Amino acid sequence: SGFRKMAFPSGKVEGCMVQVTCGTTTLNGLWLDDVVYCPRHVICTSEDMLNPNYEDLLIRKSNHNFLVQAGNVQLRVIGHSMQNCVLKLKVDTANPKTPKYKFVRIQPGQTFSVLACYNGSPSGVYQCAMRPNFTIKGSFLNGSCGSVGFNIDYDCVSFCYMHHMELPTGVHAGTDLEGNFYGPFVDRQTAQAAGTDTTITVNVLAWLYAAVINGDRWFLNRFTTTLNDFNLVAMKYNYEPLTQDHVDILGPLSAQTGIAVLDMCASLKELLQNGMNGRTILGSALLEDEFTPFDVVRQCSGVT
Amino acid sequence: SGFRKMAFPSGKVEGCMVQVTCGTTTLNGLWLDDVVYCPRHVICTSEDMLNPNYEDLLIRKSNHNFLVQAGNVQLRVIGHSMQNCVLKLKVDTANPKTPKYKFVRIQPGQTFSVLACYNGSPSGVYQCAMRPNFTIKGSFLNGSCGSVGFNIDYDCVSFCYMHHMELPTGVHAGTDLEGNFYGPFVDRQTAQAAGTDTTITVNVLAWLYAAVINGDRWFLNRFTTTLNDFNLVAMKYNYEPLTQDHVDILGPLSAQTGIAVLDMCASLKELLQNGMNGRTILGSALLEDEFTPFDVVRQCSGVT
Numbered sequence: 001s002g003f004r005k006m007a008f009p010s011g012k013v014e015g016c017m018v019q020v021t022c023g024t025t026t027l028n029g030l031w032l033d034d035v036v037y038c039p040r041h042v043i044c045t046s047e048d049m050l051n052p053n054y055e056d057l058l059i060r061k062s063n064h065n066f067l068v069q070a071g072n073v074q075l076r077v078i079g080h081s082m083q084n085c086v087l088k089l090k091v092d093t094a095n096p097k098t099p100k101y102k103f104v105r106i107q108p109g110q111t112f113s114v115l116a117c118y119n120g121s122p123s124g125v126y127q128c129a130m131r132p133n134f135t136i137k138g139s140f141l142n143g144s145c146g147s148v149g150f151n152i153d154y155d156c157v158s159f160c161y162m163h164h165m166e167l168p169t170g171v172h173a174g175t176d177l178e179g180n181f182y183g184p185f186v187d188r189q190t191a192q193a194a195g196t197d198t199t200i201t202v203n204v205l206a207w208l209y210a211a212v213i214n215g216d217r218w219f220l221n222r223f224t225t226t227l228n229d230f231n232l233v234a235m236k237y238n239y240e241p242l243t244q245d246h247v248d249i250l251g252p253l254s255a256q257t258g259i260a261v262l263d264m265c266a267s268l269k270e271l272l273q274n275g276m277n278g279r280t281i282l283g284s285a286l287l288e289d290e291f292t293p294f295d296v297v298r299q300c301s302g303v304t
Numbered sequence: 305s306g307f308r309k310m311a312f313p314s315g316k317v318e319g320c321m322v323q324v325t326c327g328t329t330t331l332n333g334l335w336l337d338d339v340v341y342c343p344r345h346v347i348c349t350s351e352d353m354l355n356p357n358y359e360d361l362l363i364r365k366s367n368h369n370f371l372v373q374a375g376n377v378q379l380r381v382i383g384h385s386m387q388n389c390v391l392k393l394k395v396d397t398a399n400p401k402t403p404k405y406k407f408v409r410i411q412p413g414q415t416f417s418v419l420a421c422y423n424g425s426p427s428g429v430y431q432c433a434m435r436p437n438f439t440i441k442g443s444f445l446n447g448s449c450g451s452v453g454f455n456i457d458y459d460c461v462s463f464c465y466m467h468h469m470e471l472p473t474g475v476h477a478g479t480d481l482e483g484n485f486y487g488p489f490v491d492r493q494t495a496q497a498a499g500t501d502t503t504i505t506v507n508v509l510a511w512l513y514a515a516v517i518n519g520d521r522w523f524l525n526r527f528t529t530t531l532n533d534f535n536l537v538a539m540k541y542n543y544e545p546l547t548q549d550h551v552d553i554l555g556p557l558s559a560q561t562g563i564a565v566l567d568m569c570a571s572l573k574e575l576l577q578n579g580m581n582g583r584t585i586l587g588s589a590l591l592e593d594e595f596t597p598f599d600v601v602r603q604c605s606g607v608t
């Protein structure tokens with residue numbers, strides 16, 4: 001009973017967080033095996049920020065300029081390299097707390113947990129979605145760069161995001177763990193257009209199934225729709241067009257509840273066209289899109 | 305930039321979770337030092353649930369009947385005692401991962417993080433409020449009993465909640481770590497009245513300050529109010545009456561934003577009387593009450 005915006009347990013990631021200082025700037029690093037990963041802008045100063053020449057700035061740095069501290073203990077840096085927008089600092093000691101892990105590039109519309117950190121110390125954990133336009137709407141202040149996003153499958157942490165930037169709009173941008181930005185963004189202090197965003201339709205449908213499972217059923221109706229008809233409504237309301245691949249991933253939820261996907265689409269269509277009429281669904285007064293079908297199945301079945 | 309429903313990092317609590325089995329039933333236990341704490345209903349069977357005679361059921365149990373497993377390793381139980389609705393199982397080994405901790409009884413209206421667990425394994429973490437009527441609106445399934453709620457202050461975990469029950473309404477009830485229920489509840493399978501609940505006014509005001517800090521300002525107006533006038537509106541809308549102690553705890557937010565507490569009350573009064581007119585505040589289409597003033601200051605300042 002109940003449905004919450006649940007994050008993965010953060011302990012495995014907490015054991016990987018370190019502080020990285022280069023010159024003036026301190027941000028977070030991720031220590032896995034004998035490598036510390038961090039955003040490359042740790043090597044910048046204020047005059048560099050409008051458009052840093054990262055290759056030249058890094059040429060001025062030596063291994064001993066990267067101060068890496070794992071809580072109390074200092075790590076000895078024996079190599080450094082820049083890969084896309086991340087720095088990889090080779091250290092002489094493997095992290096004893098390295099969990100089983102993978103680096104993955106997530107798709108827009110997928111969700112993950114963020115462990116927000118400052119000075120290598122964890123502050124809090126929250127769940128969010130990668131928007132269809134590749135931005136994230138997080139909670140990050142100065143010093144949070146290098147905090148990571150991740151998912152967990154049994155004892156394996158799949159790292160998918162490293163935080164690099166707050167755009168002038170207050171929205172967030174970052175990279176995969178190979179330093180490739182999600183979206184069109186570059187690590188410099190400039191206004192940068194984020195694409196037109198959309199609402200993640202398959203996630204809203206998954207959340208309506210979570211609602212029915214938990215007893216919030218007022219939005220169920222006597223109607224059905226088709227993919228074509230629903231997609232005309234999705235177009236009007238700036239929702240992602242629904243495909244058979246999305247219908248297929250909703251199969252487990254349709255099977256559990258007995259509510260055909262297109263019948264749930266007809267509920268969503270009515271909610272888009274009429275609003276909530278001052279009512280709530282799972283404690284929300286809007287249509288929630290930060291739960292994937294996998295998240296709903298996991299939370300509704302108690303996966304550990 | 306940004307404001308999220310952030311939970312505390314769960315690692316310190318993950319290291320304390322164990323599985324407790326007595327007879328048929330398996331639930332979670334909390335291992336701190338050489339004691340494992342768990343809900344006493346682990347000793348019940350189905351015929352007991354309507355009104356268990358806990359003293360008689362426990363008299364049938366011996367130390368060797370409590371199977372306690374910390375992941376892979378088995379703990380040896382050398383004593384057992386029932387304190388209110390919790391069992392305390394003395395074990396022969398102190399938990400090496402015991403963090404600095406306290407047991408606290410929280411006040412209604414305060415918030416905490418829950419580490420939802422099944423079979424002693426963490427599933428996810430979320431933040432919630434203890435309702436004014438002492439219930440919690442969590443996400444808990446069968447097997448989640450014994451999961452705990454907590455707050456963290458530097459390296460000290462203050463445990464405040466242990467999950468015991470899902471009421472027939474789907475709302476949740478539990479105890480402090482001495483086994484005393486929050487609210488009028490008893491650990492038996494019966495319908496039990498939860499008091500009339502209210503919205504946590506001081507938390508809604510704190511969240512409106514978080515909104516202004518993050519740039520959501522549309523609800524600010526040219527008005528002011530008084531405590532008396534605001535409390536007439538709070539009465540109508542089932543909000544907790546605001547006191548000077550609440551105004552005082554909002555001081556830091558009023559000081560940071562320059563918006564007097566009673567002026568923010570006038571914004572809240574207008575929102576209660578007129579609604580949101582289809583707009584959102586910090587991604588919500590309702591007035592959020594699960595952030596205390598302390599939570600807002602912590603998240604807005606990056607406390608670790």
Ligand SMILES: Cc1ccncc1NC(=O)CN1CCCCC1
Nearest residue numbers: 140141142164165166187188189
């Ligand atoms: C202030 C803040 C708040 C939240 N998240 C990130 C930041 N800081 C930046 O974005 C700095 N930025 C990095 C990329 C190159 C230009 C400088």
Ligand SMILES: Cc1ccncc1NC(=O)CN1CCCCC1
Nearest residue numbers: 444445446468469470491492493
């Ligand atoms: C099924 C479930 C889901 C979420 N949270 C808890 C439960 N289980 C119970 O409440 C069982 N209950 C314990 C107290 C004495 C009577 C039996």
